[PDB]
Design an enzyme around this catalytic site. Structure first.
Site, short mmCIF file in Angstrom:
data_model
loop_
_atom_site.label_atom_id
_atom_site.label_comp_id
_atom_site.label_asym_id
_atom_site.label_seq_id
_atom_site.Cartn_x
_atom_site.Cartn_y
_atom_site.Cartn_z
N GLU D 62 0.85 -1.19 0.00
CA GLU D 62 0.00 0.00 0.00
C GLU D 62 0.88 1.24 0.00
O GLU D 62 1.71 1.40 0.91
CB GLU D 62 -0.93 -0.04 1.21
CG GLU D 62 -2.04 1.00 1.22
CD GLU D 62 -1.61 2.35 1.75
OE1 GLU D 62 -0.68 2.41 2.58
OE2 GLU D 62 -2.22 3.35 1.33
N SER D 131 4.32 -6.20 11.87
CA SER D 131 3.13 -6.35 12.70
C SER D 131 2.35 -7.56 12.21
O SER D 131 2.02 -7.66 11.02
CB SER D 131 2.28 -5.09 12.65
OG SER D 131 1.53 -5.02 11.44
N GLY D 135 -2.51 -8.38 6.81
CA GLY D 135 -2.34 -9.22 5.64
C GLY D 135 -0.95 -9.16 5.05
O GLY D 135 -0.22 -10.16 5.06
N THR D 136 -0.58 -8.00 4.51
CA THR D 136 0.70 -7.88 3.83
C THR D 136 1.87 -8.12 4.78
O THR D 136 2.80 -8.84 4.41
CB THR D 136 0.83 -6.51 3.15
OG1 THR D 136 2.12 -6.40 2.54
CG2 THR D 136 0.66 -5.37 4.14
N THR D 170 -7.57 -4.06 17.06
CA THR D 170 -7.99 -3.09 16.06
C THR D 170 -8.78 -3.73 14.93
O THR D 170 -9.72 -3.11 14.42
CB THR D 170 -6.76 -2.37 15.50
OG1 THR D 170 -6.03 -1.76 16.57
CG2 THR D 170 -7.17 -1.29 14.52
N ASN D 197 0.92 -4.38 22.15
CA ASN D 197 0.83 -2.94 22.38
C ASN D 197 0.33 -2.61 23.78
O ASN D 197 0.66 -1.56 24.34
CB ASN D 197 -0.07 -2.29 21.33
CG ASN D 197 0.52 -2.36 19.94
OD1 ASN D 197 1.72 -2.53 19.76
ND2 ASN D 197 -0.34 -2.21 18.93
N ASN D 219 6.92 3.26 19.39
CA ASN D 219 8.00 2.93 18.48
C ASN D 219 9.34 3.46 18.97
O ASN D 219 10.38 2.84 18.71
CB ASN D 219 7.68 3.48 17.09
CG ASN D 219 6.37 2.96 16.55
OD1 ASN D 219 6.11 1.76 16.58
ND2 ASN D 219 5.54 3.86 16.05
N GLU D 245 26.04 -15.39 19.35
CA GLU D 245 26.10 -15.95 20.69
C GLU D 245 24.77 -15.85 21.42
O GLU D 245 24.71 -15.42 22.57
CB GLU D 245 27.20 -15.27 21.50
CG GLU D 245 28.60 -15.49 20.96
CD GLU D 245 29.66 -14.73 21.75
OE1 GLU D 245 30.83 -14.70 21.32
OE2 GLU D 245 29.31 -14.15 22.81
N1 LIG Z 1 3.33 -1.21 17.85
C1 LIG Z 1 2.71 -0.79 16.74
N2 LIG Z 1 1.76 -1.58 16.14
C2 LIG Z 1 1.13 -1.16 15.02
C3 LIG Z 1 1.43 0.07 14.47
N3 LIG Z 1 0.67 0.23 13.37
C4 LIG Z 1 -0.11 -0.86 13.22
N4 LIG Z 1 0.16 -1.74 14.24
C5 LIG Z 1 -0.46 -3.06 14.44
O1 LIG Z 1 -0.60 -3.72 13.20
C6 LIG Z 1 -1.81 -4.46 13.16
C7 LIG Z 1 -2.37 -4.51 11.75
O2 LIG Z 1 -1.33 -4.58 10.80
P1 LIG Z 1 -0.79 -3.23 10.11
O3 LIG Z 1 0.70 -3.10 10.31
O4 LIG Z 1 -1.50 -2.03 10.69
O5 LIG Z 1 -1.15 -3.36 8.55
P2 LIG Z 1 -0.24 -4.28 7.60
O6 LIG Z 1 0.72 -5.11 8.41
O7 LIG Z 1 0.49 -3.40 6.63
O8 LIG Z 1 -1.28 -5.23 6.81
P3 LIG Z 1 -2.37 -4.61 5.82
O9 LIG Z 1 -3.62 -4.30 6.60
O10 LIG Z 1 -2.69 -5.61 4.74
O11 LIG Z 1 -1.85 -3.33 5.19
C8 LIG Z 1 -2.75 -3.75 14.12
O12 LIG Z 1 -3.47 -4.69 14.88
C9 LIG Z 1 -1.86 -2.92 15.02
O13 LIG Z 1 -1.90 -3.42 16.33
C10 LIG Z 1 2.39 0.87 15.07
O14 LIG Z 1 2.66 1.97 14.59
N5 LIG Z 1 3.03 0.44 16.21
MG LIG Z 2 -1.46 -1.42 5.40
#
Ligand SMILES: Nc1nc2c(ncn2[C@@H]2O[C@H](COP(=O)(O)OP(=O)(O)OP(=O)(O)O)[C@@H](O)[C@H]2O)c(=O)[nH]1
Ligand SMILES: [Mg+2]
Ligand SMILES: Nc1nc2c(ncn2[C@@H]2O[C@H](COP(=O)(O)OP(=O)(O)OP(=O)(O)O)[C@@H](O)[C@H]2O)c(=O)[nH]1
Ligand SMILES: Nc1nc2c(ncn2[C@@H]2O[C@H](COP(=O)(O)OP(=O)(O)O)[C@@H](O)[C@H]2O)c(=O)[nH]1
Ligand SMILES: Nc1nc2c(ncn2[C@@H]2O[C@H](COP(=O)(O)OP(=O)(O)O)[C@@H](O)[C@H]2O)c(=O)[nH]1
Ligand SMILES: [Mg+2]
Lengths: 430, 49, 430, 430, 430
Positions: D62, D131, D135-136, D170, D197, D219, D245
């Site tokens: 994306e 994360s 999906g991705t 979320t 989180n 972060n 190690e």
């Molecule tokens: N610690 C932390 N977790 C995050 C952050 N942004 C998203 N997440 C976590 O990521 C999860 C969803 O995956 P995302 O990273 O938001 O989206 P993605 O991994 O790109 O997957 P897509 O939805 O297909 O785009 C959520 O449940 C959030 O808890 C962040 O900035 N910090």
């Molecule tokens: Mg995304």
């Protein structure tokens, strides 16, 4: 160098030329007084293609105007840009043909044609290197369809190696203005296939359809149809008068678009065409040009091109543009429409680029495609011909001037043979 | 629950058939093309003669 | 005391000659007027006081491109009477430019070649450029090669032909004359380099990041390749290579001399300096199948011999350390009867940049000329395209009527079949 | 001569990569433009003159986040063509990013990885951030890990995955792809660190006294943990620890490599200096259950091995005197078959502060990486959440229609059951 | 990238679009003349989502307007922002449907739809990466509910993998303006479930209730209902046009809100909404937004959401705010209302944050929840349908145009089956 002369006959051909020469003069910046007033240097480098030079610095077209009645040429002289034509080239008779093919080809057209052939020979012998001739005439009239086609044979007999163009308007059954149209259409098509190197059919019905649907103007007139035909005519020889990435003269198109010597009947179309109110909405891009170029309603003929398969196609792009985009779009228009392209000849689309666009437009395209869908026009013409001939209607007018029914039978048989052997390759498979 | 198992069973059976059909068609087309080319070669010899 | 003469015939040939002749003039410091404001002697000649004259001749039957050359900024550079021009174009017809109109022009070209050769004392060989898919280009190239092979004999001639793309094509009849010209130059040219446009389009799109390229961008890359090939004759180097030292290193057998080229690095100034451009990474990029200058896959065949040129500050030990890595890889395999297949050349002069162009200035570059067994695919696909239309004898009447015999098409087909059998016979292990 | 490559995939991965890359640039004195106004070599590479290029690659399907990166203040730092971006998002669908759109992007990422690896000479290993509940992120992380495990083999890879919170969530479908990704990285990653989180939210609320935190605050703490982990490779220390190690000290068995982290001290400048921050009190705070970086209770399970890093002016004798106190306490009990379970590292460089951030400047800090038996609770609760919806086959049609088979869900469930049984089998005393 | 095209049909859909496009243009700062006059850089970065680019720098929406009568489009053109629409996209008939579903779906709508499908195909083939289509139409009218739904099937047949949105206004029994509403509502719901990927029901009765109770304005008009619907429409795709903490395109919502492929009928609501006199009293905070978001009277449908249990829910927050507060409030709204949330799918609320608020507001929320309470609307629609159909009232109008009673019986049975199987999961327990 490699210039061509203009010869037109009949009223329809004279009216087509009266706008074709206006368009050419406006393109080259020539005033109606024959004085150059252009802006760019390129406007004068290749002016010898269509214009001759005389004392006093003025330019004169190398056009020859012929008709069996004096009215049309006496009228075209009073129109704009009518003074450019040399008075010596005007040749006419005092009787006319009356839409009778026999009178314009056997009795009256035979005696007069010597004078016009004299000036034709004068024009061709003089010029630097001949490229060929282009002919504008109508198949719906007697004097035109007779004298023009006999002149085609006379010219071909003396210049067998030069190229010959004919822009022919065939009578459509929808908008009919003459009852004896099938007879002189069928008689003319017989002679036209034997001598013309290229033929381009144009229909008034398709022009009205285009004017009503694409331009959406309320009241079409002959001036608009003539303007469209003139733009299409000018688009073909543009790269021969201007530099470009891939120059392609008429002979190169002849090589690449005619697979067999008897299949040389093309239908054309011009893009872009937009209404006055929508000329600001649209953006001129190569995809936009190519999508309108292959549009069925954009063809200058009522023949439906998705009722058959293209044997080959050609496009003459104008303006400055990237070649990679042109090639990829040509490939895309051929991959998405594989059903409508014959399969035993691969890569059957020719492209050319000219860096000089039309005055007022940034991009333009002229399309010339040889398709099997043209059979429908000859089918309906022959259908009307055989419906009228079986009762020998109006036959006495033709038979009273030395013609017989045997020449009608041979013409019908040859036309039907052409129709059959043109579609023979449509069902051919590898 | 019965409906749930049955529904998945009927859907699973579908998809497999479609993949197999496509594969068979492609193989057949390739063999036919080879045969046509050999036939063309013999025909070529006769016209040349 | 070492010289080379370059021959440019056809529109594509002239348009790539212009591209190489800006680059040479820029690289040797000569202004477009020909005046400097001892390495020039390879391409130029001293007139005694002042200007330099290129050792090049431009040929074409269609006058537009030559007229464009004679009015541009380079009007003062070329000798006025070595830009031989015709009047009538061949119009994509091979038989025209080999039998009809090329014969009357070839004598003047041969006289010019003699007049240029008598000046040289250490003539290394000839270079020739011609786009294959055209009438005048292929026909005149064939005729000139055939005349030179008997007038001079053992002098080396190099051909930078541009074959048509696998699917992208501009004409519809180019397979016929491509096959005939391949027939003609198979037994008459010592080296032939593949240059189809589609691969270079992909290179520009992927590396140069240009989405709308034109022919000039392609010709600049070709000019850079030519300069890299001929740098060793006019600049000091630790490991020199001469033109005559090719058939002893890249040509295993007299029939097999078609090879495909590649160049590296190709990168724009916007992101060039962010990475170090080490010799290892550039020599890896040069062997990438996607960076071939012809649309052929080297993974589909064996390698026979690789001749690859460096220029800049490269050190031989770094070159050896990178040749070892390539020998290590399992995706690149050489033929069994060739234990070592690399010929390496090192030059000190870095590649020169053309202002307003695409490529940036770098200190290291690599150009490879590689002979591989995979080249047979282009011959096979061109043969398949030819057979489809030759089955029905389409477009043949345009060739039979220009003096060529009916049987001339068959023997070119037989020679291509022989070449394809030879390529298969060579690639099998013992 | 020691290097490490960090991989950032998904929105969360890119947003934590930004957080770590401000910190590294600040810690090594490099300006955001990449220019300094021998420790940098671990994360950066020298271009020969001037700027430094990070050894990092950003991945996402994306484009919004990458476009935000390419326009911020750090536009000049990263190489323009290592920020690989797609067009269509996976939209929280795991099957999309593993079978449909990730496959066409993974090849470019692998090419970039090779181009970065050939530059390094002493490659320690890879870092990856993703994360899990997307999906991705999960899909591409799984595919990249699977490709790397066979392309390189024994090279070490570390995964800083962010699992969903026990109750706070979320999305609504994140248990499915979390379980599938755990399946994928169970047999493919050498180290996995827990990062949910909710625990970090509680840490911020209790210590930093922020009542409205955003993702940036989380972060920054993660970036500080990464810096503390990798400090020993680029700074002089009395007791060094390398990445290789670890599996010899924290991983008793190949299956068990999920561990949870903690950091101390976490305090704001408004009340930091009122207390002495001795080593004993910080090492006590690090072992507090409420300061775990993942929402798990260590009091519910045994410890297996504790690896804990110090940095600053700490003296080893004070560290030993504090390890003894922890061994004394009755609320912390180790597993029977592990008499000593502590690995201690000491570094001299104090943690660096980011301007405008939350944490203050201190001279002593401690970061612990502890492997404990209590981690099975998160697996059990994720399994319970998964079973509830998998009983009725909810949301399965969104996965079956993207190429994944029906049975693929069951085997992940079986592997989680196997892991939970293994964790119970290990924790019983002999 | 990932842009969508707009297609609207009928009078109600045209009036909805006439305000939706005004709202979008005001959001992006586009003047009614198509000239950008915005203030922020972000206003132009992702303008390709809804607007095309033409020569002269002006922007044109990619909307397609269709109706069976010309009056409504002849009226919308004279309204504000009416000049943006391209005149070519206006397609209309000369007869109309007269609120008869059969005429607008079998006899008249079938012949006209080819022209509108031509322009639809032109728009979709051209665009960079398609995301999908969004449809606005009313189920209470004949031409709309017929032609729109048939167009849905035609589009789905050609683009099976793209996403499809429909904003459908269903006829409520309270405010009835047409007597034949049940027939064309029941017939349309039959076809709508089979092809639409997402459906969002909107009721005029709920809009009047909201306007009278929350905004407390004296005289509601169609302009206010259209403005509320337009704000709700814009809120869904906001994060696709602007950066944010957690971007979530339409496909991500499709994955997370539809458990089974036939349950895709949502009801929506917008917050905040306050009266003019109380806009100064209220303070905009996340608790204040979330308490109004789940309020029963705030739903855009008369369906009472505490008469059933939510299968899932979604929220799209706008403005800059802390994520921790959003997550904790979402958890709190789910712990205090556990009775109204289905228990076999835990964590069934999705959240997203976009940093760009609406013009004039600092925070905004769009709510999309899939609930079982929607059964009541289909129940009453089917009740009226079966009350009217049992006497065959008004049936001859439909049966005189090729339709029969069997298609009525099948539609009623399928609608009742949908009603039953939608509530089947309400009583389901784990
Ligand atoms: N610690 C932390 N977790 C995050 C952050 N942004 C998203 N997440 C976590 O990521 C999860 C969803 O995956 P995302 O990273 O938001 O989206 P993605 O991994 O790109 O997957 P897509 O939805 O297909 O785009 C959520 O449940 C959030 O808890 C962040 O900035 N910090
Ligand atoms: Mg995304
Ligand atoms: N790489 C490259 N190829 C070109 C260029 N111009 C033309 N060609 C190729 O040349 C082929 C046709 O031959 P041309 O060079 O255009 O024409 P010609 O060789 O002079 O032959 P004639 O048509 O008789 O004039 C086309 O298929 C093009 O692919 C060019 O500028 N660069
Ligand atoms: N495009 C165009 N066609 C014309 C014009 N005048 C006549 N025609 C066509 O020519 C046909 C009649 O041809 P005619 O005048 O009898 O030709 P003639 O016998 O050679 O004089 C009619 O069917 C018209 O469609 C004109 O000004 N423009
Ligand atoms: N929100 C809104 N609804 C409208 C408007 N005009 C009509 N409607 C609704 O549309 C219904 C009638 O639909 P109709 O005009 O017959 O649709 P058509 O048959 O496609 O033209 C009525 O019940 C109205 O409630 C409007 O301007 N705004
Ligand atoms: Mg040429």
């Amino acid at each position: 160098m490699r210039e061509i002369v203009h010869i037109q006959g009949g009223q329809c051909g004279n009216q087509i030329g009266a706008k074709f020469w206006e368009v050419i003069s406006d393109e080259h910046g020539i005033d109606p007084t024959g004085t150059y007033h252009g802006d760019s240097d390129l406007q004068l480098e290749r002016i010898n293609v269509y214009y001759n030079e005389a004392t006093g610095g003025r330019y004169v077209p190398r056009a020859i105007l012929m008709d069996l009645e004096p009215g049309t040429m006496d009228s075209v002289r009073a129109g704009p840009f009518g003074q450019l034509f040399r008075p010596d080239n005007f040749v006419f008779g005092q009787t006319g043909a009356g839409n009778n093919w026999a009178k314009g080809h056997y009795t009256e057209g035979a005696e007069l044609i010597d004078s016009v052939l004299d000036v034709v020979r004068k024009e061709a012998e003089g010029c630097d290197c001949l490229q060929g001739f282009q002919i504008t005439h109508s198949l719906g009239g007697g004097t035109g369809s007779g004298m023009g086609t006999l002149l085609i044979s006379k010219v071909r007999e003396e210049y067998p190696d030069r190229i010959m163009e004919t822009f022919s308007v065939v009578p459509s059954p929808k908008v009919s203005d003459t009852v004896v149209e099938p007879y002189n259409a069928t008689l003319s098509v017989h002679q036209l296939v034997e001598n013309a190197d290229e033929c381009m059919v144009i229909d008034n019905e398709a022009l009205y359809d285009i004017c009503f649907r694409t331009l959406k103007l309320t009241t079409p007139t002959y001036g608009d149809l003539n303007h469209l035909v003139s733009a299409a005519m000018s688009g073909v020889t543009c790269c021969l008068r201007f530099p470009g990435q891939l120059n392609s003269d008429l002979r190169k198109l002849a090589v690449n678009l005619i697979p067999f010597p008897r299949l040389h009947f093309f239908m054309i179309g011009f893009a872009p065409l937009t209404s006055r109110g929508s000329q600001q909405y649209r953006a001129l891009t190569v995809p936009e040009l190519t999508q309108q170029m292959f549009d069925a309603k954009n063809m200058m003929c009522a023949a439906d091109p998705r009722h058959g398969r293209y044997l080959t196609a050609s496009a003459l792009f104008r303006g400055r543009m990237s070649t990679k985009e042109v090639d990829e779009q040509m490939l895309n228009v051929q991959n998405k429409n594989s059903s409508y392209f014959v399969e035993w000849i691969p890569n059957n689309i020719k492209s050319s680029i000219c860096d000089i666009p039309p005055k007022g437009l940034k991009m333009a395209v002229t399309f010339v495609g040889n398709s099997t869908a043209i059979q429908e026009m000859f089918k309906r013409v022959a259908e009307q011909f055989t419906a009228m001939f079986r009762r020998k209607a109006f036959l006495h007018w033709y038979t009273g001037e030395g013609m017989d029914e045997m020449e009608f039978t041979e013409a019908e048989s040859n036309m039907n043979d052409l129709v059959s052997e043109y579609q023979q390759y449509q069902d051919a498979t590898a | 629950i019965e409906k749930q198992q049955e529904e998945f069973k009927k859907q699973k059976e579908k998809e497999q058939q479609e993949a197999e059909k496509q594969r068979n068609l492609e193989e057949y087309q390739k063999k036919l093309k080879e045969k046509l080319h050999m036939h063309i070669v013999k025909t070529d010899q006769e016209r040349i003669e | 005391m070492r010289e080379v003469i370059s021959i440019h015939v056809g529109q594509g040939g002239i348009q790539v000659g212009n591209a190489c002749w800006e680059l040479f003039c820029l690289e040797h410091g000569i202004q477009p007027d020909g005046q400097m404001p001892d390495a020039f002697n390879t391409f130029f000649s001293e007139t005694g006081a002042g200007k330099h004259v290129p050792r090049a001749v431009f040929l074409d039957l269609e006058p537009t491109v030559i007229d464009e050359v004679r009015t541009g900024t380079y009007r003062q550079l070329f000798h006025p009477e070595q830009l031989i021009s015709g009047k009538e174009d061949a119009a994509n017809n091979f038989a025209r430019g080999h039998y009809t109109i090329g014969k009357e022009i070839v004598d003047l070209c041969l006289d010019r070649i003699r007049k240029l050769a008598d000046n040289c004392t250490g003539l290394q060989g000839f270079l020739v450029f011609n786009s294959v898919g055209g009438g005048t280009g292929s026909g005149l190239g064939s005729l000139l090669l055939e005349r030179l092979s008997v007038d001079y004999g053992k002098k080396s001639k190099l051909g930078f032909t541009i074959y048509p793309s696998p699917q992208v094509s501009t004409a519809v009849v180019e397979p016929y004359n491509s096959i005939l010209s391949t027939h003609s130059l198979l037994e008459h040219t010592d080296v032939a380099v593949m240059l189809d446009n589609e691969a270079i389009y992909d290179i520009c799109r992927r590396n140069l990041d240009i989405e709308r390229p034109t022919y000039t961008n392609l010709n600049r890359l070709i000019a850079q390749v030519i300069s890299s090939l001929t740098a060793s004759l006019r600049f000091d180097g630790a490991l020199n290579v001469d033109i005559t030292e090719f058939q002893t290193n890249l040509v295993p057998y007299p029939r097999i001399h078609f090879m495909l080229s590649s160049y590296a690095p190709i990168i724009s100034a916007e992101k060039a300096y962010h990475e170090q451009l080490s010799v290892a990474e550039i020599t890896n990029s040069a062997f990438e199948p996607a960076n071939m200058m012809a649309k052929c896959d080297p993974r589909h065949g064996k390698y026979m011999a690789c001749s690859m040129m460096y220029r800049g500050d490269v050190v031989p030990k770094d070159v050896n350390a990178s040749i070892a890595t390539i020998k290590t890889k399992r995706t690149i395999q050489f033929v069994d009867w060739c234990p070592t297949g690399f010929k390496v050349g090192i030059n000190y002069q870095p590649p020169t940049v053309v202002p307003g162009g695409d490529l940036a200035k770098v200190m290291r570059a690599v150009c490879m000329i590689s002979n591989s067994t995979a080249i047979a695919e282009v011959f096979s696909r061109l043969d398949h395209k030819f057979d489809l239309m030759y089955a029905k004898r389409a477009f043949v009447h345009w060739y039979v009527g220009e003096g060529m015999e009916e049987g001339e098409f068959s023997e070119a087909r037989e020679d291509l079949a022989a070449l394809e059998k030879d390529y298969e016979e060579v690639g099998i292990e013992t």
